[PDB]
Design a binder for this molecule. Structure first.
Ligand SMILES: CCCCCCCCCCCC(=O)O
Lengths: 334, 334
């Protein structure tokens, strides 16, 4: 009887490199407070944030994704010609269509390679990485680009006081391909749609379009709800990711949680029973919460300062919007 | 050092069922011809469309995805409790965040299952299907929901004689899980970002938001460009999908191309060398082009009339926006 064929690729997959792009402009809490009622100290105190980058007007999630990919390719010693596909994960591509992925591939000179946009709120990176690994192992690609990119600044209500100092822009990509050793552990993910409102665009685009003189949409954040959720639930997610990867808490060298808030992550570093000398990402201090691009930008920073070395065993935990989370254990890139 | 472990699932994966939801408001060509200088015969002879469905104002891509999934689960004799994850593919979720996936899972009572939104324009279904299959084989889930949903009507410029009669609304989901036989063939996909302009939202949401009194965004289509592209390039894509699946053209029982234009698809049927009695989807006549929901809606239609039977060998070819395409050979569901 005719049977549909089954294919497969390299069983061992890993992060060949990481490339990060940060917008030239810097924005201080004071600059922020020059339109808000609070302190440049109460900010960096309740949220380890001191400064963040805002992209120019002529930039987009797509353009920053492209530059991030160029850097990842160079850091991996590859050219666009070595890439089989690209997954752009973002929440700020301001067009219902076309997707950013095909445009990014074109800008890289990457022919008609497959690609798509993945949106899972802040945890889109973990979902995209897992997807790239599954595709490569399944034989649908051999080498891929996974880039998290975000241009949130244009969606911030400078008068929100609840998040205007939280979100920021930026993009970071990783090259995923075959490695001698297993570099990407099993994906652990889930969500809580019951709390979809905790991080949302308040007005949908069509309603706004039908009421142009009415209020325009802005990103709203129910900080406490998110703070509690992550702090209390990401510890369990961390253990599952380690368990699935067959690793124990004490074997983790690097911890890269979503750069949502220092207070949440410091609490997680303790609840995960990581060893005392475990390196922890704190890229948020001068980058803020870049949602989907957060983790890959944080990984790049840890490597940047040498705090993390290639080969290091890291625990990645993305949590955020939609109330989605995605985690995995990986071997640091570059 | 410590080797990161792996996990794996069922090698044989397939379509357990399909569930389709079509908005109740039927819009005829004559209704469309109240705002353009055309006629029913002109539109029908050139596109193959006679009527299409428009969703109500209180409906959304997410609400239609929910209902489609409910039907799919029922057609598979399963409950939300049997689902491990859900992938929503769409291009008309009018919120930059949160994603529709977490909300859809919540609405189905599928507690906190993993999920994300995937946009590859019109070919998002093929990509999501392949991703679901790769995840299940990768052991990241055992059973999943893949739902294409689209509420394009609000993005249509009623005066655009180039596409006002083309796009429509609807949603259809399939349950993906382990099957005795291999039911999903290898994914064959790619794109042409050089032609990203062929199907696009003309004005990005932020620019509009910063000039509310200016022109609002609408979907635009460069018909001829798309027509030529699909007609000339999908044949090669179909052959590759069949090759990867180890099947010959004559073995295809059912052909389900994206319902973009009946003339493009009639040309493809011939160019693919399908046998004379091959059943070809023509759901477009009363459904129009529902982009991401097109293929699963067409599969449901063929099964409903009994034209396609469960177990039938089918060739699916998604093509569209961003200039993205995704294809695979599968065994019909339900
Ligand atoms: C004859 C003019 C009508 C336009 C027909 C062009 C066919 C392509 C439209 C479908 C676009 C898509 O892939 O979603």
């Amino acid at each position: 009887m005719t049977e549909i064929a089954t294919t497969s690729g390299a069983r061992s997959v890993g992060l060949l490199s990481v490339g990060a792009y940060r917008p030239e402009r810097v924005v201080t809490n004071d600059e922020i407070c020059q339109h808000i009622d609070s302190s440049d100290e109460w900010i960096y105190t309740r949220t380890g944030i001191k400064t963040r980058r805002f992209a120019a007007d002529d930039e987009s999630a797509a353009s920053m994704a492209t530059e991030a990919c160029r850097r990842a390719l160079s850091n991996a010693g590859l050219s666009a010609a070595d890439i089989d596909g690209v997954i752009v994960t973002t929440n700020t591509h301001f067009l219902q269509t076309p997707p950013a992925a095909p445009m990014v591939a074109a800008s890289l000179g990457a022919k008609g390679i497959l690609g798509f946009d993945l949106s899972a709120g802040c945890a889109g990176f973990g979902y995209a990485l897992g997807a790239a690994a599954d595709m490569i192992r399944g034989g649908g690609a051999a080498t891929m680009l996974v880039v998290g990119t975000e241009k949130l600044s244009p969606t911030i209500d400078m008068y929100d006081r609840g998040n205007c100092f939280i979100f920021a822009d930026g993009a970071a990509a990783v090259v995923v391909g075959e490695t001698p050793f297993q570099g990407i552990g099993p994906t652990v993910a889930g969500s809580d749609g019951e709390q979809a409102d905790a991080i949302r665009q308040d007005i949908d685009w069509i309603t706004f379009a039908q009421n142009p003189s009415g209020p325009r949409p802005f990103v709203r954040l129910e900080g406490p709800a998110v703070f509690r959720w992550a702090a209390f639930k990401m510890g369990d997610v961390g253990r599952r990711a380690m368990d699935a990867a067959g690793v124990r808490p004490d074997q983790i060298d690097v911890f890269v949680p979503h750069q949502a808030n220092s207070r949440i992550n410091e609490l997680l570093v303790k609840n995960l029973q990581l060893r005392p000398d475990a390196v922890v990402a704190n890229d948020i201090e001068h980058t803020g919460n870049t949602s989907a691009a957060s983790i890959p930008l944080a990984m790049a920073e840890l490597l940047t300062t040498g705090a993390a070395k290639p080969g290091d065993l890291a625990l990645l935990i993305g949590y955020g919007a939609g109330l989605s989370y995605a985690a995995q254990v990986v071997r640091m890139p570059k």
